[PDB]
Design a binder for these strands. Structure first.
Lengths: 351, 351
DNA sequence: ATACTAAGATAG
DNA sequence: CTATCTGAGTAT
């Protein structure tokens, strides 16, 4: 039972990029399940074998982490092409991990055949004919089907909480009480549209000491529709395995709403936050039914509520520790189900 | 008082390179102050002592010419590493000359520890703990504090017109009346974005016989946001300390704006142009408050103001001299106050 | 060959 | 939008 996992459109080397670190963490958690698995990527590395140095048919299961197939600057992206070349040569069923609604499986050939560099590839080289099963992170399989109604070789759809790999990792550790230095903290990147509105709403002009870490830059918030005076402090990105300790430096860590996740996907951030020493405050829009934590106090709808809830927390150490113990209790109930989780995954890749 | 001066990331031997010349010229101007100074670098030379043969703690003052940490080809950069090991062993305050907004002081250790060759160094030998005093060439100390935010041991800030070392040199001599063969001249290299914009706004489609020397070619200008028909004449590189001799060839030398220096840093260029037989014209953005010269005639806004002024100088050999006589009187008044500059420097390195 | 380059591409 | 990531090309 030899399993191969690859990222469809991103180089896999270290933990310095989101797609790469996720592919490696998926490889690590699948290994810890007692499965023999390799990561194939563009070159040999600490975690990967080269596409050029293996026959895709030496594996009984091919898992493909979703990625986009857009070619930046119209130039050839070897990460995409080499991965699909590899997929096309596979004579068996392909398991596509759908963790981002914006990244449904997609053939590259069509987007390649009309390129100046088209001569480099042939349709037989890139066209994937194998049947594909989509393992959707989003519980709503209707949305998963919709996004793939463009590709006919997708024949199975199944829901599997992939993002739970962060809490099921053997070395998982709850954050320990921490000396606070921030009222509210939020990690992410800038995104125009409703995403800008949402962020200015919860992070700007709160009157609280807030830190926005990640890839966002203050000067990206210019839209006159969502004005502001006092912005939060911006910080550089942080290692995947440091997120929870980074969040723990604040009394409260926020989860903002997003049209591509709301009531459908539980995200890595939810767990990273719920695991920290920071009380997890969730944008009502993100989880209307409160599937995450069955306690209204963990939810906020606007700036007034966020400000009010955070101030109740910065004064009441007792209220803070209680909420903290409730979110840790909920996390652990989920963790207790590890074995069911692992079997569900084996079951999802027909093992 | 024994003073040691080093360049953080460049080797110092002679005047064959930009950074080396700067360090040696800084060295000479300080020696001419009657101070005891030594240049410490990689190998012993006419102007330098080797890092591996001197004990940094023998000096009462350690001056570090700003530089960047860029490990070309991912390989160890000996000037940066030797320099920072030297600085790390130092036990008193460090004086960092910030002559370029792009070169804030930076620790190299965080960079080295994650390199495959990290085992060749220890944090004890690279981590610089001594307090740092940034002596900024820019007069806006807020722009200087802003740049050194990442660092924590940078305690002081102070402005000092460092670029003036060229005029106060016991060597300095104004350029004598030169036979004109160019209407306009400008030295430098192109970068991108607005850098190219400006260079095209002031040196292209003017109808004037303009020359452009340094690291720059014609095709390097593609951006269809700033279109041009007739480009100036590119003369490539010239010696490394004959800029004044070069500029004097034209009727007027140009100083164009730059997001980094504008209303902050007076550059070596300014003084090398102000010292030439060429009338120095300045981009209004580079110095709006008109600090350089107090006379509107030397400043321009766009291609219009430019070509116009150059014409007034061509059709009035009398006007040329008058303005030329003005800039020289300014330089002369600055040079006469050499002692005020020197004493200001001493007070900068706490003497 | 020798020595210098004040760093360009990428992340989200 | 720049902090972070990657890792030899250019000038003598």
């Amino acid at each position: 039972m030899k399993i191969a996992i690859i990222n469809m459109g991103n180089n896999v080397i270290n933990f310095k990029t989101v797609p790469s670190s996720e592919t490696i963490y998926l490889f690590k958690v699948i290994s810890e399940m007692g499965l023999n698995v390799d990561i194939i990527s563009l070159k040999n590395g600490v975690y990967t074998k080269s596409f050029d140095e293996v026959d895709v048919n030496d594996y009984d299961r091919l898992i493909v982490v979703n990625s986009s197939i857009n070619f930046f600057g119209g130039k050839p992206n070897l990460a995409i092409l080499s991965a699909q070349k590899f997929m096309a040569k596979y004579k068996s069923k392909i398991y596509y991990l759908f963790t981002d609604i914006r990244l449904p499986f997609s053939q590259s050939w069509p987007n390649v055949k009309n390129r100046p560099w088209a001569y480099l590839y042939t349709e037989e080289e890139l066209l994937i004919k194998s049947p594909i099963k989509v393992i959707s992170q989003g519980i709503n399989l209707d949305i998963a089907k919709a996004a793939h109604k463009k590709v006919d070789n997708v024949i199975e759809f199944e829901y599997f909480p992939i993002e739970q790999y962060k809490i099921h990792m053997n070395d998982f550790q709850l954050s320990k009480p921490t000396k606070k230095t921030l009222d509210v903290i939020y990690g992410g990147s800038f995104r125009s549209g409703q995403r800008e509105s949402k962020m200015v709403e919860f992070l700007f002009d709160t009157g609280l000491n807030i830190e926005f870490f990640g890839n966002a830059r203050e000067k990206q918030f210019k839209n006159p529709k969502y004005p502001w005076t006092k912005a939060p402090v911006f910080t550089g990105k942080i290692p995947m395995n440091m997120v929870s300790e980074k969040n723990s430096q604040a009394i409260a860590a926020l989860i903002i709403g997003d049209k591509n996740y709301n009531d459908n996907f539980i995200t890595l951030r939810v767990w990273e936050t719920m695991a920290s020493d920071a009380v997890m405050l969730i944008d009502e829009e993100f989880d209307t039914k409160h599937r995450i934590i069955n306690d209204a106090r963990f939810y906020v709808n606007n700036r007034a509520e966020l400000i009010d809830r955070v101030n109740e927390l910065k004064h009441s150490d007792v209220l803070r520790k209680e909420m903290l113990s409730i979110q840790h209790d909920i996390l652990n109930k989920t963790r207790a189900k590890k074995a069911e989780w692992q079997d569900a995954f084996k079951k999802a890749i027909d093992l």
